[PDB]
Design a binder for this molecule. Structure first.
Ligand SMILES: Cc1cc2nc3c(=O)[nH]c(=O)nc-3n(C[C@H](O)[C@H](O)[C@H](O)COP(=O)(O)O)c2cc1C
Ligand SMILES: CN(/N=C/c1ccccc1C(=O)O)c1nc(-c2ccccc2Cl)cs1
Ligand SMILES: O=C(O)c1cc(=O)[nH]c(=O)[nH]1
Length: 365
């Protein structure tokens, strides 16, 4: 509570005054990679444990893709108190991404806009980085701290499906789950991989490559979607996910929309918008996808989570797990313990025995 206020009121506003957002992001990854973090003194209650995607999750609060793009800070993120870590997006070949500046703060909106453009060390570098800690990760996973890997595609690739297939082959064996991110707003054409006969063809190839891995090295496969889909796109995705036995959905990526009421000077920058203005658009997308999949497809809920109330709203809408990113940039590492403490308190107040009991509760009212 002391360092929650110190981080929110003094340290983060001081860092944002001294460093542009991408510099601050880079420094945050370096500090995290060295374990230079405040005490994550919140101890996970049994109430927070979730069993989904073939794994135990000690707590349902994960770090979303895009913070640790290149798998440099995984151990530091568990030390921060995340129940699970997602690295990436990782592209087959190394690529630089967009020219700088490409990350923009909207302080008045508690939002960020980014157009990183899948800056990636590439699969080989990330493969060797995860191999160096593979057994340490096996023990973390067994102790309820799973690892996800988010797979992207290179800007100049002539075959999107083959880029994802390469990622399944190279990083699948090192991951508890993989994510096919057909929802970055910052690679031309990527989101059109969300339409039907082509999405079926893409996901069929990804699942075949996954099913070709040895049993102990066989990850869950999730599809990560945009909040910007049409009703037709969402019904098509739900249909294909059920038909192919996709293991879960991540709902949602950043929005290319600009909700009415943004105040930030940088609101008209090109890129994906994250944080508070995405929150309820994300929650509503979770609700719709949970209904279209009859509650049979696990959802990881993400977009504008900054409190236990935000986490519980996504859980009651249909999420089994949640992720956050943008809240960490505003409030720093103490926001993780804050979300967990508030979520545990709210579950008790609303008469839930644990997270599991709350999943999709709004659909049963
Ligand atoms: C700076 C930045 C970089 C991101 N890069 C990625 C990415 O590489 N892959 C991805 O799937 N999502 C990426 N995202 C999206 C987040 O994973 C998340 O879906 C989105 O930001 C909503 O969560 P939030 O409001 O808690 O930040 C990125 C988000 C931000 C803010
Ligand atoms: C600056 N910052 N992230 C910044 C950041 C990251 C991504 C995008 C934008 C920004 C931004 O500045 O607008 C963090 N710092 C930590 C952190 C990590 C370890 C120890 C102490 C801290 Cl405060 C986590 S995220
Ligand atoms: O630009 C990126 O790398 C990136 C940004 C974002 O918001 N989402 C994503 O999937 N990729």
């Amino acid at each position: 509570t002391g360092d929650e206020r110190f981080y929110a009121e003094h340290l983060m506003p001081t860092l944002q005054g001294l460093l542009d957002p991408e510099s601050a992001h880079r420094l945050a990854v370096r500090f995290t990679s060295l374990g230079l973090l405040p005490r994550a003194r919140f101890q996970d209650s049994d109430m927070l444990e979730v069993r989904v995607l073939g794994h135990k999750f000690r707590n349902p609060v994960g770090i979303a893709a895009g913070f640790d793009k290149h798998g440099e800070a995984v151990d530091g993120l568990y030390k921060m108190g995340f129940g699970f870590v997602e690295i990436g997006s990782v592209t087959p070949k190394p690529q630089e991404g967009n020219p700088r500046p490409r990350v923009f703060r909207l302080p008045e909106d508690q939002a960020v806009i980014n157009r990183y453009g899948f800056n990636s060390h590439g699969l080989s570098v990330v493969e060797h980085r995860l191999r160096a800690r593979q057994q340490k990760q096996a023990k973390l996973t067994e102790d309820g701290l799973p690892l996800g890997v988010n797979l992207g595609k290179n800007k100049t690739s002539v075959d999107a499906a083959e880029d994802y297939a390469e990622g399944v082959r190279v990083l699948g064996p090192l991951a508890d789950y993989l994510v096919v991110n057909v929802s970055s707003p910052n690679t031309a054409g990527l989101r059109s991989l969300q339409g039907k006969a082509e999405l079926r063809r893409l996901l069929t190839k990804v699942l075949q490559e996954r099913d070709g891995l040895r049993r102990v090295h066989r990850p869950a496969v999730l599809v990560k979607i945009a909040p910007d889909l049409t009703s037709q796109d969402k019904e098509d995705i739900a249909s294909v996910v059920k038909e192919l036995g996709i293991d879960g959905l991540i709902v949602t990526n950043t929005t290319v929309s600009r909700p009415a009421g943004l105040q930030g000077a940088l609101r008209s920058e090109t890129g994906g918008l994250s944080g508070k203005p995405l929150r309820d658009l994300s929650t509503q997308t979770i609700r719709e996808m949970y209904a279209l999949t009859q509650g049979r497809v696990p959802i990881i809920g993400v977009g504008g989570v900054s409190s236990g109330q935000d986490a519980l709203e996504k859980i009651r809408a249909g999420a089994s797990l949640v992720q956050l990113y943008t809240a960490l940039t505003f409030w720093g590492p103490p926001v993780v313990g804050k979300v967990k403490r508030e979520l545990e308190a709210l579950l008790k107040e609303q008469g839930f025995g644990g997270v599991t009991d709350a999943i999709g509760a709004d659909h049963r009212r």
